[PDB]
Design a protein around this ligand. Structure first.
Ligand SMILES: CNC(=O)c1ccn2c(N3C(=O)CC(C(F)(F)F)=NC3=O)c(-c3ccccn3)nc2c1
Ligand SMILES: CNC(=O)c1ccn2c(N3C(=O)CC(C(F)(F)F)=NC3=O)c(-c3ccccn3)nc2c1
Ligand SMILES: *Cc1c(COP(=O)(O)O)cnc(C)c1O
Ligand SMILES: *Cc1c(COP(=O)(O)O)cnc(C)c1O
Ligand SMILES: [Mg+2]
Ligand SMILES: [Mg+2]
Lengths: 366, 364
């Protein structure tokens, strides 16, 4: 019936008692939640209900809900930043709405009007705007979440769903607020995602399967998993981050390389932004290309590697110092090379996020 | 550690729901009066198990089951016998598989015997829901979810184990073989080497819905899951795949894909392999089967039967595969189907207590 919900229909139930804000320098990522959340119910029978902004509450779900049985679920991750000018900005949020819509279609969750969801998210951040931290090293994490709630054990396209948005204040990625280079666990026994799978979507099913390898990484003194793919051991992603390699390539050219979007790579907003910046600067070759462990070890032997880093909303730029592979520790000289490019990218993205320079990539809160 | 069945806290419902007509049941849509719930935390371990009225779950919206598919499930049945004794069927294999799935999911381990006793006590309390029909059964859905209120992608420090009961009818309303048409599109891959395809983890299923919709759009009832450059035939929807044929060496053979990481080790699959091995009437091979193997065999009139196996269907004969724009006929229904019928008769006779078997347990 109701094709899609509208921000103009928002029903706002303000909280009576507002919670004390956390210290932005003693925050664990995604553990502290703001006063309010967005919820929107859908059914096949009646379509989208009116959207609600209401106090953070537990969800009341039928125990047969397909999100709990068949991972009929997806999420997004984007941030609000309090600028040096005290204006709150979103960063490329229409890219998150596009990616969420694409994920919903592949999940068989009901489609929604992307502009109306973004306006609902803006109104939620506006209401909880004092949760956007007063710190140029902290931000407000925005977690749109979309779950199948049909009370049927049939493996089927859902006839009931809930779209909701949580807000979580977060500090710097590492407590130190400076580059803490990560050690990676590279075990080809595990595969994050495969050709013909859903690795290019933020569907919950891609993450539950990763926890065992992450635990093995921590057991072996590593902070993140290096996700290897195929007989040639392609390096694909670092934990929940896109993978960048800054090196002299096989042709002796200075190059920033990242795996191509061939179906096993999550198309990161950060990844997109870094490729755009590197293209704009025009100071070295920019290549979306396959990179193997043998490519990397051959390059290290030839002193051709400068930097390796992950990219993502949570870290921005996460330098890599070491990879544990085939029972050996392989040193990556990222931190002995500045890291010049990683630092330059972090400085440029944070200058844009916190309004130190104007950009088409930011929207001031409505 | 573990919860213990001896600690069960039973809160009976004071209002009972009307039992459904056993001949008008939609699979997994009707739920019984009671459920099992058991809370876990890293801090305190397993809480006492509860049998209480079916209720909504109250979950923190940050629960890792909702964000990162930190979840697994099982599927097994209780059957009201011809002698009116309620029986479970190979339930220890479900407990083994659930335990193994929990380890792969990084959910907390539990005592398999304690969970089975808790399930028996739940079915016993709701035993009148086990249908009065030799074509209907009580579906048992153990479910295990991460309830950590954290957006970190991490091993959960909070979890809920629960069990739902759902009365269900025959797989097809007719209660006779309705052979399935399969949609074979290699662009979709159910599972990969180094993934979780050999575990009943929720994450393996959410990704499948789009392909299932495409199957139904093209007049097919199930997806044929193809893998690799050679187009291995792996599974049929949520069922293991059996091929009864004359193999390349001219030998009568029952073939099924091997457990190399992309196959869910079905209880029904296990039972069928056990029966075929016991009978000793033909070769039994856990081997790769490709679309080219199958079409070469069909061209040589070497195929007898193809069927899916699973708790829901038992034996699901396959009549056709839509592949590369061609409808490929499988002569299953023109060959009896003799083996499919024999397997269905044997397993249903055991389930409904028409013959004694080590595979069944009479309810606690
Ligand atoms: C072996 N371990 C892994 O490979 C691993 C994987 C993911 N990780 C994250 N992490 C999320 O938890 C969530 C997250 C998204 F996408 F939700 F924002 N991004 C992420 O980087 C973090 C993290 C996140 C935020 C702040 C500090 N640390 N650390 C890891 C480690
Ligand atoms: C393109 N479509 C597919 O490939 C497809 C997939 C799974 N399917 C099931 N089905 C579950 O829905 C659930 C289920 C488990 F495992 F939970 F018991 N088994 C299952 O066979 C059913 C079904 C189940 C019970 C009764 C009648 N029909 N039909 C399909 C079709
Ligand atoms: C979210 C995510 C990324 C990073 O995407 P951003 O939009 O830059 O936050 C990378 N890899 C995986 C697997 C992800 O889920
Ligand atoms: C559950 C399941 C089966 C069948 O298992 P049974 O124990 O026989 O019910 C087959 N394949 C997949 C993918 C499954 O999830
Ligand atoms: Mg519109
Ligand atoms: Mg041929």
């Amino acid at each position: 019936v109701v094709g899609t919900f509208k921000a103009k229909d928002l029903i706002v139930t303000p909280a009576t008692i507002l919670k004390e804000k956390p210290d932005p320098n003693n925050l664990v990522f995604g553990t502290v939640f703001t006063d309010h959340m967005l919820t929107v119910e859908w059914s096949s029978e009646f379509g989208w209900e009116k959207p609600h902004i209401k106090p953070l509450q537990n969800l009341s779900l039928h125990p047969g809900s397909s999100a709990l049985h068949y991972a009929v679920e997806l999420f997004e991750g984007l941030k609000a930043f309090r600028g040096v000018d005290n204006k709150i900005r979103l960063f490329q949020p229409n890219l998150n709405m596009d990616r969420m819509y694409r994920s919903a279609v592949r999940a068989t969750l009901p489609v929604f009007d992307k502009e109306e969801l973004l306006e609902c998210i803006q109104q939620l951040v506006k209401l909880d705007q004092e949760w956007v931290p007063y710190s140029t090293s902290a931000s407000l994490y925005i977690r749109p979440t979309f779950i199948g709630t049909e009370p049927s054990l049939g493996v089927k396209k859902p006839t009931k769903a809930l779209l909701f948005v949580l807000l979580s204040p977060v500090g710097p990625y590492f407590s130190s607020g400076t580059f803490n280079p990560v050690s990676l666990w590279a075990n080809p026994k595990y595969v994050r995602a495969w050709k013909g799978g859903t690795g290019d979507c933020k569907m919950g099913g891609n993450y539950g399967s990763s926890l065992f390898a992450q635990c093995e990484a921590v057991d072996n003194g590593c902070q993140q998993v290096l996700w290897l793919y195929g007989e040639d051991h392609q390096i694909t992603e670092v934990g929940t981050m896109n993978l960048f390699l800054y090196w002299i390539n096989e042709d002796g050219e200075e190059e920033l390389a990242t795996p191509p979007l061939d179906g096993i790579i999550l198309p990161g907003v950060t990844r997109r932004c870094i490729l755009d910046l590197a293209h704009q600067w025009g100071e070295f070759k920019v290549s979306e290309r396959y990179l193997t462990m043998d490519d990397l070890t051959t390059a290290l032997e030839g002193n051709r590697v400068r930097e390796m880093f992950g990219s993502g909303t949570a870290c921005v730029v996460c330098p890599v110092s070491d990879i544990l592979y085939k029972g050996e520790t392989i040193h990556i000289p990222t931190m002995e090379n500045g890291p010049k490019l990683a630092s330059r990218i972090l400085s440029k993205l944070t200058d844009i996020q916190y309004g130190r320079e104007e950009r088409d990539w930011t929207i001031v809160l409505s």
